[PDB]
Structures are given as structure tokens and as C-alpha cells.
Design a protein around this ligand. Sequence first.
Ligand SMILES: N[C@@H]1CCCC[C@H]1Nc1ccn2ncc(-c3ccc4ccccc4c3)c2n1
Length: 274
Amino acid sequence: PLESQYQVGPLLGSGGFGSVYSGIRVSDNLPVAIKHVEKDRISDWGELPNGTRVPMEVVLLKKVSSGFSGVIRLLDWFERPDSFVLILERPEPVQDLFDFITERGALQEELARSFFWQVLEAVRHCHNCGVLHRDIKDENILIDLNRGELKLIDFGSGALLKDTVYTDFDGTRVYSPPEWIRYHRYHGRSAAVWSLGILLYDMVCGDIPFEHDEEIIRGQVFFRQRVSSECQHLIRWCLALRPSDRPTFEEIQNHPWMQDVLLPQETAEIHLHS
Ligand SMILES: N[C@@H]1CCCC[C@H]1Nc1ccn2ncc(-c3ccc4ccccc4c3)c2n1
């Protein structure tokens, strides 16, 4: 088979996640993203039913890639002596929610609402498939700027969803809940709902609410921009210091602020086109 059925293009980015490149599938000019993960930097390993020892991201993406969904799909993967190479779907034109907020600042509530709903729909899909992302943030959300469809990326800090406590967090500290900071213990859904509150505030305020551990432990949110009282209410609910006091994905989606959402194409025509 060999790994030269893809044509390598510009390096999209690099970090602890490895290196991501823009690619093209030679067989049908399909756009793809190629991620190279060094074997040494793999924290949590997984195993495929056939016995192959692989990165956990491959396990979790195979559980959620039975599309369609708001999750970037794993098309293929390869093993090399000192690395693993993942072939993922690449929307085009595409923009990162982090870069989108860097350019446009605080998003209008109608846009934040459409974007936030699609994340909820995507996260619910991962949970329905027994996968937990565990690093929900603007940097891990791509926008298909023509279709106005958002898609989740980077399951490298994810895990299989479980009803017991997690005592491992390899995600963004400023997006981590107070219970992780204090006890180094959290539960999947409530820790996902905290991060969703950090995300919605980031959308509507143009920045995360907390920079340091004390601000997190305190969990008191100051609104720097004009934001509706219903939106502030949902944010503060998602950011309840006690996990049990946070909403469920159903309660978030049934909140008065989450009503009369736009469809992806309407959002792109009103807010993204031109
Ligand atoms: N969060 C960054 C946004 C801009 C490009 C580099 C990104 N860093 C990462 C980190 C880990 N992963 N894991 C998968 C991706 C990924 C997947 C598909 C992509 C499609 C188009 C553009 C970037 C893409 C990034 C990724 N990007």
C-alpha cells in the first residue's frame, strides 16, 4: 500500500500534538490533513480489536468516525518505526475558532449560539459513541467557512467515557474545572460542561474568563462585553463550582438562550460569506 498515496503540502501547525500538514489524496484530489505523532510523545495508548498497539486518538476516532457528525473523520492511519501518521478530513476554505476570534473579537450572540449548539451536538455525538474529548476549546474547533459547519479536532487527550472518576488531565489548564485544580479528580460530563462554559464566554467576550488557578477555584465571572442576561445565566450555570450543580447537555440545549438557532448555511450567509 505505502504512505505515498497522499501529496504533502504546507505545515499547518506543530506542538506537543506532533505536526499537522495540509495534504491531498492522489486517487481523487480529496483534501486531507496529515498528523505525525512521535511514539515517545504518546501518553495514553490504545489497542485495536485485532491486537495492534496504537495511539488512543486512533481508538477514539474510529469509535466516532462512523459519520456524519461534527467531528473531523479519520480516513486512514499508518505506523512508522518512531511515529504514527493520521490522515484526517480537511474542510476547505477552513478557519480555526481561535484565529476567527483573534480577527473578529467577541462574536454576536446569534453567531455564538449557532457555533455553541454545533459543539454541543458534536460532543453529544462523541458521548453517544462512548468517547470523551477532554480538551474542548476554540483551538480544537474548525469552521467550514462556506457551509458554516463546525468540526471537533485533536482527540489526543481524550478517553473512553466512563461513569467513574478520572485522575488524569492532559488538557488546557485554563479550560480545566475547579475540582481538577483542587483534588486532581473529575467526572467526564461535568468536566465537559465546565469547558463548554469557558468556550461560550470566549465566544461572546472574545477571551477566556480565567487566566490563573485562583480565578478558577473562585469561579466568579466578570463580563467585559455587553452580553444578554440569559447568555450570562447559561455561562454561570456551566461554570457552577460544584459539578452536580452544572447542567446536562439537554438542559443546555433547552435553555431559553439556546432557542431559535440558525442552520449552518444561514450562519455562513449572514456571518461568514464575503
Ligand atoms: N489547533 C490548530 C489549528 C490550526 C492548525 C494547527 C492546529 N493544531 C492541531 C493540533 C492537533 N490536531 N489534531 C488534528 C488537527 C487537525 C485536523 C484537521 C485539520 C484540517 C484543516 C486544518 C487544520 C486541521 C487540524 C490538529 N491540529
